[PDB]
Amino acid sequence: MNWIVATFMLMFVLVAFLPLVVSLAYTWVTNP
Amino acid sequence: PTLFPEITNTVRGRFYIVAGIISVVMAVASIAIFWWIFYTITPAPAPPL
Amino acid sequence: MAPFLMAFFTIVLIVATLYFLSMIMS
Amino acid sequence: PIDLHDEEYRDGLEGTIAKPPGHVGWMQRLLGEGQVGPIYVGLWGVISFITFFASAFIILVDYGRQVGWNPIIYLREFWNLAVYPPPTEYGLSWNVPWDKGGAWLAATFFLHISVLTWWARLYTRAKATGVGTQLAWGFASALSLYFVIYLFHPLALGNWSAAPGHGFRAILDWTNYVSIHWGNFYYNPFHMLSIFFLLGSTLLLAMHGATIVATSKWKSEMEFTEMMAEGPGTQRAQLFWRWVMGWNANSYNIHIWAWWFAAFTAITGAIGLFLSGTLVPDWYAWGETAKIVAPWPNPDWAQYVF
Amino acid sequence: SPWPVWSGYALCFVPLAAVILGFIIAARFTDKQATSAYLRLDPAKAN
Amino acid sequence: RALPLPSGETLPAEAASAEVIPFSIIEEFYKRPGKTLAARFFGVDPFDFWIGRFYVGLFGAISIIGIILGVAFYLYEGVVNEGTLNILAMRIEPPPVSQGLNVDPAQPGFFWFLTMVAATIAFVGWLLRQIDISLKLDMGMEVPIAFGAVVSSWITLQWLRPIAMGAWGHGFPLGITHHLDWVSNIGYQYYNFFYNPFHAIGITLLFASTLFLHMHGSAVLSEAKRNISDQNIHVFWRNILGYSIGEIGIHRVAFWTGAASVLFSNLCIFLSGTFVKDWNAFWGFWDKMPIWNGVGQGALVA
Amino acid sequence: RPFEFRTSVVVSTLLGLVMALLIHFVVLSSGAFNWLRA
Amino acid sequence: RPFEFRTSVVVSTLLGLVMALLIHFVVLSSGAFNWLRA
Amino acid sequence: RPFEFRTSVVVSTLLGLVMALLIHFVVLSSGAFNWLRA
Amino acid sequence: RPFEFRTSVVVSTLLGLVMALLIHFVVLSSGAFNWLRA
Amino acid sequence: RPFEFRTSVVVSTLLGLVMALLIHFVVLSSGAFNWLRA
Amino acid sequence: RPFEFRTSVVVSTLLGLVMALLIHFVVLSSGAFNWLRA
Amino acid sequence: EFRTSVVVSTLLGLVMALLIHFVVLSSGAFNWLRA
Amino acid sequence: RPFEFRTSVVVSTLLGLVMALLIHFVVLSSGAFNWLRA
Amino acid sequence: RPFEFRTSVVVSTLLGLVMALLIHFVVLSSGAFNWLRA
Amino acid sequence: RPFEFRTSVVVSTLLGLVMALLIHFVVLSSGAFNWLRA
Amino acid sequence: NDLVPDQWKPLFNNAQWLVHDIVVKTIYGGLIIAVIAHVLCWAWTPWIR
Amino acid sequence: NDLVPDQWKPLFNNAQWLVHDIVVKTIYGGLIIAVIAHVLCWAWTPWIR
Amino acid sequence: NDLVPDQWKPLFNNAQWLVHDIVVKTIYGGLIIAVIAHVLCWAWTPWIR
Amino acid sequence: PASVGGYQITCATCHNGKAAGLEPYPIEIMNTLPNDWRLPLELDYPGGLVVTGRKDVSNHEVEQNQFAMYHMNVSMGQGCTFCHNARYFPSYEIAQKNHSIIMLQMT
Ligand code: BCL
Ligand code: BCL
Ligand code: BCL
Ligand code: BCL
Ligand code: BCL
Ligand code: BCL
Ligand code: BCL
Ligand SMILES: CC(C)=CCC/C(C)=C/C=C/C(C)=C/C=C/C(C)=C/C=C/C=C(C)/C=C/C=C(C)/C=C/C1=C(C)C(=O)CCC1(C)C
Ligand SMILES: CC(C)=CCC/C(C)=C/C=C/C(C)=C/C=C/C(C)=C/C=C/C=C(C)/C=C/C=C(C)/C=C/C1=C(C)C(=O)CCC1(C)C
Ligand SMILES: CC(C)=CCC/C(C)=C/C=C/C(C)=C/C=C/C(C)=C/C=C/C=C(C)/C=C/C=C(C)/C=C/C1=C(C)C(=O)CCC1(C)C
Ligand SMILES: [Fe+3]
């Protein structure tokens, strides 16, 4: 439980990153 | 008999169901099989002296 | 009985999936 | 009366260099402008550049002296190398050996000149290109904090050791040591004000950038035009913030908010740092007499122990 | 004895009062200006 | 006619398509009901009205439930249960780490759990309501993205890290001046959180956020009420620093730096709890990377 | 009309629900009743 | 319509589901019943 | 008219509710009454 | 025509999936069933 | 002209001032002279 | 007209109120008077 | 997009392979590289 | 105007003030002169 | 054209220089050869 | 022309200077020569 | 607004009057139930003591 | 709205009346089931004690 | 605004007057209840002592 | 106190299986400290590393204090709040700070 649950929560922190990354990729793709 | 003809009739939309299913099971199998391997090969933390 | 039940519920998941995907893939 | 081409493409001192402007390309795709453009060299940029170069050169060759002149130990310890101010003994004196704070005093003096002449450059180029001098005064607030850290708080404490040690790890160490020496900076109330203004700075920056990028389709980003007549993007921005939180700003007010939140960050920080050493030696002890410290009779310390 | 020190008060509470009050007043005037009538592009046309 | 401008300047009309329009007109033109997230999902937004200036959606009502209940639970735990009467000395503490992840109404720390759950409901409802209102105004989803960065910073501190640690007492107490005690004790437990690299990145982006905010407020205020060709600020920003990011670029960088600061920050506190116990010990590998192990003598060896 | 009837209904119903939840939680946490093992 | 039937249905159903979940979670966390090993 | 009647109603009602809650909380936390197991 | 059949299907299916996931996770975390470890 | 006289003057004067300060700083910190109680 | 009269009134009234509060709090915290329990 | 699925699958496979190799090597279970 | 007189005045005055402050600071901190009770 | 020749030249030359420096460092720090008093 | 001659000159000269400095510093710090009291 | 009494015609629509009647009757029923619940909880455990 | 009684014609559409009837009958069935569940849980373990 | 007395006609609409009457009567009832509650709480436990 | 335990110092306490070549301050525990740094046993320890609000010390003494405190962090892996309430370091809340005073006097 320690490492499985810990890594699932880690992946949620990185998921939180994800939206901003989508914003940057949006800017790049839509500015061609 | 469907309400999402653009999702269940068209090959591109019909394919999206299989794509989503396969991606969900691929991610779940990824995580589950990793943690299985890790917990079976990793030794138990050495018993306290 | 837990391994029995987990296998049972995964096969019910799979058979459900074959059934309704068969309908969608009709 | 202001030639925008002449201010960009004059030559020499009181002119620009790198005048054939390059294009970065990815900066144009991601940020919308990729021209590096010419950069001005105007007798204040020169003082700034050469005094900063003197400062950095002193610091770097003292890093070299500290690693026994070994350029690998240099690269390995570069981030924990630092040129520390003179120790507490002989604290304000400048007759300190070069290795024990002698290099720090010279480098810090040249850095002072560099930041002051950079302020002068900001001011003179704002006047030369026709814009207001708001950036020079914002830098002056930042410099108020800076000169408290390096000049005014070491003085009035009696020792140069109160100042940071010119290093990648030394500034973090300095912040730790100063909060530890004066109790707990969390109970420094002007530190709390400055954190209010810093986190409100980041909150307003994020909100402003996000609002303008969201209303970007209707050219909300052209603030100069929007301040003459508010277009549909600025209207949508105002309505978004009115419906979200019941009040809004226009194209002009929001930048007043921005400027003042950042300036207050710097100013309240300077005040709190100057107060910590000279007037209130202990912030937690002061916080108990101020009744702002929560009683903690029986803390659960299992959380904080491994 | 129940009373914080003069120092405590000055420092924490009148800056607390100033920040709260001043923020509220600045917001009041921010929105008076923002909701006043000035040159906008008519929405029916420009949009 | 005087022709009042958005800045507050009255310019005498000759010395554009603009007309002096009342805000009430702007506000009523842009109402457009029924575009919200709830109206896509259910076919209708249950609350599609405005209460005063505020838009009340489905997620606005959820958010206001969360707000009222969170404020009332906060003040119950700290006026009652603590008896303090002054908000600077009250101590809204989670259940003890002894209790683990389970919650008990009889045990202390129950009203912290309720305040945290209602505050999470309030914050997520605020985020979803921002999505509502951006959908109503045909805007981009950037404001919800930034607020989601900070809401995920809250989720990390009160949900993800306490769950991963497994004790629910690893959430920070909800006390003015006392959550600072938690921040200090967590910062020193994993000693030198300054050496935490995601923490250093977070501080770098916080300082850069305040710097960009000052520079942008300066730039827009400096060209505000002057006869300027809109290229004066660009020339100024190329004379200083030899680069002008442009109008759309400074707002993009604003949004991005703002969000990224707290994103790297929540990565820092989460790692600080679960994977790294000591942030000085973390950097033990650096002097042993094999490219500079061997070269040193005395204190100059490592 | 000073107050839309729908607005008053929403506000009153939400206030009543929030107050019922708050009072239930205060009474249950008080341990004064011996309800749900109190 | 101020009072659409669809709106009342959505609100009532969501309120009922939220309240059922809340009450289940309060009762399960209370440990007052011995349900699911309590 | 200096004040909309709706504004005065909202302000007075919210002030009264906030004050009732505050006074109830202060009186209950004082332990001066022996109400809800003192 | 109110209540499109498509809408009811989407809402019911999503509610059922969310509830199945929630109940599975609550039951697995309770350790009454011990994440199937037995 | 390729070189402006004002530029050379600024550069030379600033270099001379920086070098005078640096050399004074180095000589005073060396403690080799007994100047200002060394 | 160097100053609007309304501005001077606001500033003077706010300064007087702030100073009255500050002086009252300084005098009460000094414990020099025996006012409100010494 | 097929390119998106390819990128995601390839990156997941590489990350998985690295993770499993590192877990197996650190376990000291197999006699690999003097373990 | 290769050199503006105002520029030279500003630079010379600022240099003189900075140097006076620096020299005063250095002489005071040296403790070589017994100033203000050393 | 997939690759400008200048780009490939820059990348290859920088990679070669970085690798030469890295390998020299690694070999010198290993102390496995008596190079430079090792 | 793949490479401006000025660019190659700048890069080569800077690389040579950096490498000369690096090698001098490595050799002097090695203490392998007895140069400058090593 | 025909169904509304003319006293309350400035305030209540025709449909709002029926929903108001439902709300009033629900509030009254809830009040009776609340009074009964309070009397029962007092007979069980007085909270004022 | 012909299927709707005239008393509720200002409020209920023709289709909304049938869905309301379904909702009412579902609420009644759920109430009966909830009463049965509460009686069973009380006979099992009284929560008021 | 006919129902409003001419003294308060500059301030009160026709509908605002009825809602004001409701608010006034509610405030009066709440005041009577508050006085009764205070007398009861004083007879129970005097807080001034 | 007995709450610590009744553990007593013996041979293996300091030798840990090595007769000679005992190295206090190995390079493992000198990670971010200066390698030359040693515990300052010169000072009178019930108050030797005290730094808070002193006004006769500055960041140099705070740095020495922090070197000693991180040495204690490594020596007992429980980190910095093992014997401190980090909101006030001068406080003796945790009672491992008193044991540490006894141990500083002992070393
Ligand atoms: C075990 C005893 C516990 C307790 C545990 C619970 C639990 C557990 C629950 C309640 C719920 C309720 N309890 Mg209780 N309750 C207790 C003590 C009390 C006391 C009292 C003072 O003692 C009171 C007054 C109540 C009052 C109530 C009501 C709020 C509610 C039941 C009626 C209701 O409105 O919803 C009636 C419910 C319906 C009308 C919903 C009908 C839904 C239909 C039947 C569908 C059901 C879902 C179905 C499986 C989906 C199938 C779909 C497929 C596609 C076909 N409880 C004690 C402490 N109580 C229930 C509730 O719903 O909360 C809102 C519930 O969840
Ligand atoms: C005490 C002996 C110390 C030492 C301490 C110093 C100090 C101290 C200084 C030098 C400086 C210099 N030394 Mg030495 N120097 C030593 C050993 C050496 C040795 C040697 C191998 O031994 C050498 C070659 C040098 C070489 C030099 C030159 C680099 C320079 C002097 C000439 C020069 O170019 O500037 C000539 C200077 C001028 C042309 C400037 C003229 C400026 C005018 C006169 C204004 C002066 C300021 C005036 C007060 C302002 C008034 C303005 C009012 C408005 C009217 N030193 C020994 C170790 N050396 C001086 C220098 O300037 O460094 C650049 C200096 O500051
Ligand atoms: C706090 C500031 C208040 C205010 C408070 C007062 C007061 C109070 C008075 C006036 C009065 C005046 N004010 Mg006014 N006034 C305000 C705003 C304004 C503004 C504005 C810009 O709009 C203006 C233009 C004015 C203008 C004026 C004139 C109409 C008038 C005559 C002043 C004069 O001749 O001074 C000349 C006189 C002096 C400057 C004397 C200076 C006094 C010094 C301080 C010595 C005082 C000795 C002290 C009493 C003894 C102390 C002993 C202790 C008891 C131990 N006021 C603001 C709002 N104003 C005066 C008035 O109208 O008379 C009926 C007066 O009484
Ligand atoms: C107990 C003695 C304490 C002390 C405690 C206080 C306190 C406490 C106060 C002062 C205040 C003042 N003291 Mg002192 N003071 C002391 C020693 C001194 C000494 C001296 C050298 O010894 C001096 C010169 C002063 C000087 C002063 C003045 C600054 C001021 C009184 C006149 C003034 O300008 O405001 C005159 C005030 C007015 C003109 C305001 C008029 C406001 C009107 C009357 C409304 C009042 C509020 C009212 C209740 C609101 C009702 C509204 C309803 C809607 C109807 N103090 C000693 C140490 N001092 C008073 C002050 O106001 O500070 C600004 C004050 O608060
Ligand atoms: C006590 C002896 C200390 C020492 C302490 C100081 C101090 C202290 C100072 C100097 C300063 C200087 N010293 Mg010394 N100095 C020492 C040893 C030396 C030695 C030597 C090798 O021994 C030398 C060459 C110097 C050389 C110098 C020059 C750099 C300078 C004096 C002339 C100058 O240019 O400015 C001439 C100054 C002027 C032309 C400024 C004129 C300004 C006018 C008069 C206004 C003055 C301010 C006035 C109060 C403002 C009033 C305004 C009101 C509105 C009316 N010092 C010893 C160690 N030295 C002085 C200096 O200014 O540094 C730049 C100074 O501050
Ligand atoms: C002492 C033996 C050490 C060792 C130490 C080194 C060192 C030291 C180096 C290498 C480098 C290399 N080693 Mg080895 N190497 C060892 C064991 C191995 C083993 C093996 C399994 O055992 C292998 C396969 C290799 C493989 C290699 C290649 C990666 C490379 C040499 C060819 C190459 O591509 O660059 C060929 C290089 C060139 C084509 C560059 C040509 C550059 C021209 C000639 C300019 C040279 C600079 C010149 C002075 C500048 C003058 C400019 C003036 C303006 C005129 N090494 C052992 C452990 N190895 C060399 C390398 O370059 O790494 C990239 C190097 O630096
Ligand atoms: C003491 C012996 C030390 C050592 C110490 C040094 C030192 C010290 C240096 C080198 C440098 C070099 N060494 Mg070695 N070197 C050693 C062992 C080796 C070994 C070997 C395997 O053993 C090898 C292959 C090398 C290889 C090399 C080359 C990389 C280089 C010399 C040629 C070159 O390209 O630059 C040729 C250099 C030039 C073409 C530059 C010409 C510049 C002109 C002449 C100007 C010179 C500056 C002048 C003073 C400025 C005057 C300007 C005025 C205005 C007039 N060294 C041993 C360990 N080595 C030299 C180097 O430059 O590194 C890049 C250098 O600095
Ligand atoms: C210890 C603690 C914490 C105690 C807490 C004490 C408190 C405060 C308790 C609070 C209780 C409250 C307020 C409970 C609330 C109960 C409600 C509102 C239930 C709603 C039922 C709504 C129901 C069943 C709705 C059913 C909806 C149905 C059947 C919808 C059906 C449907 C509709 C209409 C369609 O589209 C088409 C057909 C379809 C079937 C899909
Ligand atoms: C220990 C310490 C610190 C002690 C502190 C001591 C202090 C300082 C105490 C301060 C007390 C104060 C200031 C109390 C305030 C009491 C108030 C304002 C009560 C308001 C009642 C508002 C009321 C009744 C409002 C009623 C509103 C109603 C009835 C709404 C009516 C309606 C409106 C408007 C509609 O459209 C339609 C619906 C309906 C008709 C119901
Ligand atoms: C722990 C350990 C030991 C790990 C190690 C194990 C591994 C992974 C080793 C890795 C080995 C690798 C990857 C080696 C790679 C070597 C390369 C890329 C060399 C590049 C040469 C590039 C060269 C020579 C480029 C030369 C460029 C030249 C001559 C430029 C010429 C010129 C250019 C371009 C001009 O404008 C004009 C003409 C001019 C001649 C001036
Ligand atoms: Fe802007």
Numbering used by the authors:
A (entry chain Y): 1 to 32
B (entry chain C): 6 to 54
C (entry chain X): 1 to 26
D (entry chain M): 335 to 640
E (entry chain Z): 12 to 58
F (entry chain L): 6 to 20, 29 to 315
G (entry chain R), H (entry chain T), I (entry chain P), J (entry chain V), K (entry chain A), L (entry chain J), ...: 4 to 41
M (entry chain 1): 7 to 41
What did the study's authors say about this model?
Roseiflexus (R.) castenholzii is a chlorosome-less filamentous anoxygenic photosynthetic bacterium. It contains only one LH, which forms an unusual RC-LH complex. The 15 LHαβ heterodimers formed an opened elliptical ring surrounding the RC, which contained L, M, and cyt c subunits; the long and short axes were 112 Å and 103 Å, respectively, and a tetraheme binding domain of cyt c protruded into the periplasmic space. Each LHαβ non-covalently bound two B880s and one B800 BChl on the periplasmic and cytoplasmic sides.
We here determined cryo-EM structures of native RC-LH (nRC-LH) complexes purified from R. castenholzii cells grown under high (180 μmol m–2 s–1), medium (32 μmol m–2 s–1), and low (2 μmol m–2 s–1) illuminations at 2.8 Å, 3.1 Å, and 2.9 Å resolutions, respectively. All three structures shared the same architecture, indicating that the Car composition and assembly are not affected by light intensities. Given the similarities between these three nRC-LH structures, we use the 2.8 Å model for following analyses of the nRC-LH structure. From these high-resolution structures, we identified 14 additional KγC molecules in the exterior of the LH ring (KγCext). In combination with the B800 on the cytoplasmic side, the newly identified KγCext molecules blocked the proposed quinone channel between LHαβ subunits, forming a sealed LH ring conformation. From the high-resolution structure of nRC-LH, we successfully assigned the amino acid sequence (Met1-Ser26) for subunit X, which was derived from a hypothetical protein containing 32 amino acid residues. The resolved subunit X inserted into the LH opening in opposite orientation with that of LHαβ and c-TM, where these TM helices were stabilized by hydrophobic and weak hydrogen bonding interactions. Near the TM5 from RC-L and c-TM, a separate TM helix (corresponding to the TM7 in previous 4.1 Å model) was resolved with amino acid residues (Met1-Pro32) from a hypothetical protein Y. Superposition revealed mismatch of this TM helix with that of the purple bacterial H subunit. This helix was assigned to cover the amino acid residues Ser12 to Asn58 of a hypothetical protein (WP_041331144.1) from R. castenholzii (strain DSM 13941/HLO8), we named it protein Z. This protein was verified with a sequence coverage of 19% by peptide mass fingerprinting (PMF) analyses of the blue-native PAGE of the nRC-LH. Thus, the c-TM and subunit X were positioned to the sides of LHα1 and LHβ15, respectively; this formed a 19.4 Å gap between the c-TM and LHα15, and a 28 Å gap between subunit X and LHβ1, both of which may have allowed reduced quinones to exit the LH to the membrane quinone pool.
